[PDB]
Design a binder for this molecule. Structure first.
Ligand SMILES: CC[C@H](C)[C@@H]1NC(=O)[C@H](CC(C)C)NC1=O
Ligand SMILES: O=C(O)CCC(=O)C(=O)O
Ligand SMILES: [Fe+2]
Length: 307
């Protein structure tokens, strides 16, 4: 396959406590959307963020995470009965049509997921879908800002991003509940499959694996964490400034009785799943692989799933 990239040895995932002091945090560049575009605080911040593959972006004022935070804390629970909050529960029993969508009980990971692409956001409380709309819209603006910063000619963008820069593509809100009762890794070490991931988290536990070094990626109040995905990496790997999709994963979280579990949620921006994966070679975006086969490949690596 033309999109494999070179092998990455994945170490066992450390426990939360031992990781907390052993692996110091990456220093992330800060940025915000202002004047209608992504702007970094520091003059070389954009270049450093593309090289780092992680950075921070201010939560835009029109995006209030509150409803998403509440949904993330409850979606995995059984309905209580006679309880208004049940509107935010029971989603392990909610079917969502489409590949890679719906509820997932990951056998070998702490997390269980509820994944909903934008065309299916009516299955969510409207106020929760509204958070996904703000995060995904931010993610598209960031993607536009990246491709402009790379000076990639705009005539290519809609094709090579499978519609994302035209606000189409596969835009997926993803809720994670880390089941602290499971004595395994929080997640597998993985690359995200797509272009730009916007991550809402408040707790430590995310690690970056970079050329055999483990470093923490710590959230910052009032900001999202942003990283890049394998589709952007493959697109740019032969260019003079390649963009890195970092390998990352969540520690085996540790919670005593009564301590709330870790949660997080993201918007993944993937190419349209009927499209093609491209790589710039000799100025031209070369078609390498269908997005369908690429997705199956990348999802197959990101989880240890016998089905
Ligand atoms: C690849 C693994 C990571 C955690 C995440 N999981 C998914 O299922 C989607 C699949 C995409 C093709 C819609 N993308 C992602 O980045
Ligand atoms: O929970 C986190 O900090 C990261 C989650 C993540 O990597 C993912 O959802 O793909
Ligand atoms: Fe991820």
């Amino acid at each position: 396959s033309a999109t494999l990239r070179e092998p990455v040895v994945l170490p066992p995932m450390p426990g939360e406590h031992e990781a907390r002091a052993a692996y110091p945090p990456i220093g992330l560049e800060r940025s915000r959307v202002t004047g209608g575009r992504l702007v970094f605080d520091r003059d070389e911040g954009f270049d450093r963020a593309l090289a780092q593959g992680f950075f921070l972006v201010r939560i835009p004022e029109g995006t209030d995470p509150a409803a998403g935070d509440r949904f993330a804390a409850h979606f995995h629970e059984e309905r209580a009965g006679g309880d208004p909050l049940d509107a935010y529960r029971g989603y392990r029993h909610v079917r969502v049509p489409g590949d890679y969508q719906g509820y997932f009980d990951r056998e070998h990971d702490q997390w269980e997921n509820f994944y909903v692409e934008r065309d299916n956001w009516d299955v969510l409380p409207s106020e929760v879908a509204r958070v996904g709309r703000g995060m995904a819209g931010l993610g598209v603006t960031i993607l536009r800002g990246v491709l402009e910063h790379l000076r990639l000619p705009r005539e290519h963008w809609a094709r090579v991003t499978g519609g994302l820069t035209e606000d189409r593509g596969h835009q997926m809100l993803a809720f994670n509940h880390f089941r602290s009762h499971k004595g395994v890794r929080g997640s597998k070490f993985h690359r995200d499959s797509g272009w730009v991931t916007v991550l809402r988290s408040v707790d430590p536990g995310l690690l970056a694996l970079v050329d055999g070094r483990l470093w923490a990626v710590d959230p910052e109040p009032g900001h999202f964490i942003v990283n890049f995905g394998s589709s952007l990496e493959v697109l740019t790997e032969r260019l003079d400034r390649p963009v890195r999709a970092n390998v990352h994963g969540v520690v085996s979280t540790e919670r005593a009785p009564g301590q709330p579990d870790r949660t997080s949620y993201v918007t993944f921006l993937d190419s349209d799943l009927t499209g093609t994966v491209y790589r710039f070679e000799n100025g031209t975006p070369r078609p390498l692989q269908s997005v369908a086969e690429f997705a199956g490949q990348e999802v197959g690596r990101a989880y240890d799933d016998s089905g």
